[PDB]
């Protein structure tokens, strides 16, 4: 969860610091990012289960 | 200065944290933090290692660094905007030398006259025909190295067309949003479906090609 | 001359989408007869169809990047 | 069904006529021999090679023995099949005559015909068929030669 | 559906069972022969018989050779020379054989001789493949 | 065709090597049975 | 020149429908040879032919947008 | 400029029929090779070749209407 | 201009006969593959090959009509 | 213009020889993959190879007739 | 004439990407209709698919370097 | 016009070499998928491939002489 | 005129390299389905595929030489 939040912040900095698109384009990209999230947050937990168990087993 | 100078350092640091964080995960902590990020290179060492070795461990991590660097570089052009039209193009040209040099390191440096002697002796290039070996030295390097520049420009365009079609769709239907929002919504998501995928597959080409080099090397 | 040849030259680059559209009918058609011999529908076959159409429409998005660079 | 206007092969044990096995085929194969298939005989059972054994010291291609002593198995069928293949049959219309057992108390002296003329096996109605190659064709004929063989023999 | 006869001289697995599919690696190829085939003859490559009965289940066997012949009609007869379940198939042997198989191959000879190995290689491999 | 077919062989020959090869394989228990299964208790009489 | 190059430029962009035209005959051709191998017609196979005619007329709709941009 | 460019606009719009004619050869070929495997000829398959030779000529009537628009 | 662009437009329409030429080869090639699968050469399959050369030369006669209209 | 357009119009009909040259590559290809199926090499298949390369070169000899007419 | 013809000279060289567009669909499509016959997907076939896609984007690395030469 | 459009007329005549190049790929591909069935390598299938690549680049030598007529 | 239509003559000569790109996929794609029937990889089919890649990229070399002719 903490990682995800850090990555979002960095992007925002880049957009503001760097040359920017149109407002409409930008607004959308942010919406576009959101859609992936909801599946992802369930996915991120699932990711967690696999690797640390595979690490623990070995 | 700051903008151009800030962009390349910024790129590095996003790859650097994963590249530091995973080395770090080899004993601590993990809490939430370390294990979370170990996830990043474990996705690299999970996902990309499903393709690698393959060429063998020796080259494997050498190429995976460029693959991750390209995908991460383009992810660092994904997010920032404006960034793709300028900085990602300068990063595509800054990835151009790495893409050229990736064949150079072992191919042209050890055999410039026939870097296909490392890459592909018999295949595309005719091994019976050193002329076709040098000709396809372009289609397996000189060009493929220009393609790797065109490949990022292929992404730039598709990313651009999303912005242009987007901005043109919202410029066309400045309704607030309304029906253009629905399509415009897609047009952004097309940025991921187009650039962020084809970007990836783009470095995947440099992967596989520098694999087919070092795998026969 | 500087604006006229920019409208009839952005039309000749729109004929480069003739390869991305006929190629898409070859990347999906050879997937129709592919799953006809069967059976790996989800994964393997249709997964290779997505990585093929992405490498088919890439010559359509880059050709529409040289089209929109002549009119905008 | 694939039938031409145009071998034979006795099948049995080496051991006697504890039924009318050998004699039956003997009969019907002598019945045969005139008619033209090919007069190639293969006798499974060398009690085949009795009942017919004279110019069936001269109409055989091969004959088989240790017929029983542990009931035949597919292997055998294949075995006998295999060498059969490499044979100077001019693979007419072959017959396999054996006694298909019918019940504890009953058997029937059989024949089947072998579409050894693979070409009848190519022909006709056999067309709709696919994997139609004189390969899988032959290469079924092959397989079936054992299958049938096995069976018949077992019967 | 299809009278699917999955049989082997020794083993009939399905007997005119209204199976939806058998995935079937004839040397012709791997196919999903579905319930009621077209006249077709098939040579069995060693592979698996994946026996999609009308049951969701698809059964494994590894098959050596034989024929499935997928008929004009709806009879499918896998006539397996020998088609066996991985259950009874020993990887320990298979792989072991298989490496060996190539090893032996290296000292083999003609198209045939090599073949004996190669066939095996191929086979054992395809078992190893399978498992 | 094949390294077999054109080595002649047969589908039988092929097959058998498969079939055999399976006999070669299998788990040992099952290998007990092996010899039963498609053996050949024969004298191959040559006529 | 201003009304000339947009009238000859809208004609060159109509050569992008030659890809979607033959690309539609192939995706509906391999579905004719696929259903010949039988039998999952309704659902699976003929339900994918819509997914193959949509990704092919998408470059056609992208080409018919270009010719209508220089015509209106 | 006005009278000329409309003649060099319906000429390049006739190069969109190069898909409707070749794609019809692709679908009617796959019905010619499809009916060989048999047996649904007077139903099912040749009734899908009419649905294929139409969708191919659907980009052959849409392209033909643009060449008839630039002329008259 | 008016007596000029008629010659640089009637020639571009002859590039529409590229689908009629490559459609005749594909419809006949799969007829040569369909009659290689046997056996209904006399009617049924090669009879349909005439019904495939007609629906492929129709997109070549309509394209040759537009080229003849801009020349005479 | 009156002398210029005939030269630009002769080359444009010479691009219609790209359909006849690939339609000969499909008809002779499907005869090369139609003779591997065997066995009637002489007659039937390769006898219809010139009968399939006649209707496909018929689009080229008509196109190179429209290219020569703008030259003489 | 000098700067005007450099705009409708890299646009006609952009329609050369239609060969690489459908060539990548014909190459990857055959690999989808190849691994369906199975089973040498990992290496052998998909590894050869990276040799065919590079030899098809080789013409794409020589056609996009042509239009980028008439630009700057 | 006279010493201009013949230089852009030899460019359009060199587009006819898209059929002699894509016809060789269709010919020398079916003689690679047909030899995979085997075993008529010499004397039969590859011998017919010499007569397959003879009527393929015959439309290309006729397209290389059409461009040579618009230069020398 | 002399410097103008030489720039629009090299661009249409680069469109003749669309046959080699789609020829490269249809020649190295039939060998991607040839080894799927197996096992002549690095023997007969992959050896003839290089002899099929050379016959198709030569029609791309004979077209890029026309594009280099109208450029130097």
Residue numbers in the entry:
A (entry chain T): 1 to 58
B (entry chain W): 10 to 226
C (entry chain O), G (entry chain P), H (entry chain Q), I (entry chain J), J (entry chain K), K (entry chain N), ...: 2 to 73
D (entry chain G): 56 to 61, 67 to 96, 101 to 219
E (entry chain H): 15 to 145
F (entry chain I): 1 to 47
Sentences from the paper on this structure:
In the mitochondria of eukaryotes, adenosine triphosphate (ATP) is produced by the ATP synthase, a ∼600 kDa membrane protein complex composed of a soluble catalytic F1 region and a membrane-inserted FO region. In the mammalian enzyme, the subunit composition is α3β3γδε for the F1 region with subunits a, e, f, g, A6L, DAPIT, a 6.8 kDa proteolipid, two membrane-inserted α-helices of subunit b, and the c8-ring forming the FO region. In addition to the rotor, the F1 and FO regions are linked by a peripheral stalk composed of subunits OSCP, d, F6, and the hydrophilic portion of subunit b. The proton motive force, established by the electron transport chain during cellular respiration, drives protons across the FO region through the interface between the a subunit and the c8-ring, inducing rotation of the rotor.
3D classification of the images resulted in seven distinct maps of the enzyme, each showing the complex in a different conformation. Initial 3D classification produced three classes, each of which appear to show a ∼120° rotation of the central rotor within the F1 region of the complex (blue arrows), similar to what was seen previously with the S. cerevisiae V-ATPase. State 2 could be divided into states 2a, 2b, and 2c, while state 3 could be separated into states 3a and 3b. Because there were two sub-states identified for states 1 and 3 there is only a single sub-state to sub-state transition for these two states. In comparison, the state 3a to 3b transition reveals bending of the peripheral stalk near where the b subunit enters the membrane. The largest change between the sub-states of each state can be approximated by rotations of the α3β3 hexamer relative to the rest of the complex by angles ranging from 10 to 16°. All of the sub-state to sub-state transitions include a slight rotation of the c8-ring against the a subunit. The different sub-states do not appear to have a specific sequence or represent specific intermediates in the catalytic rotation sequence. Instead, the differences in conformation between sub-states when taken together illustrate the flexibility of the enzyme, a property that has been linked to its rapid rate of enzymatic activity.
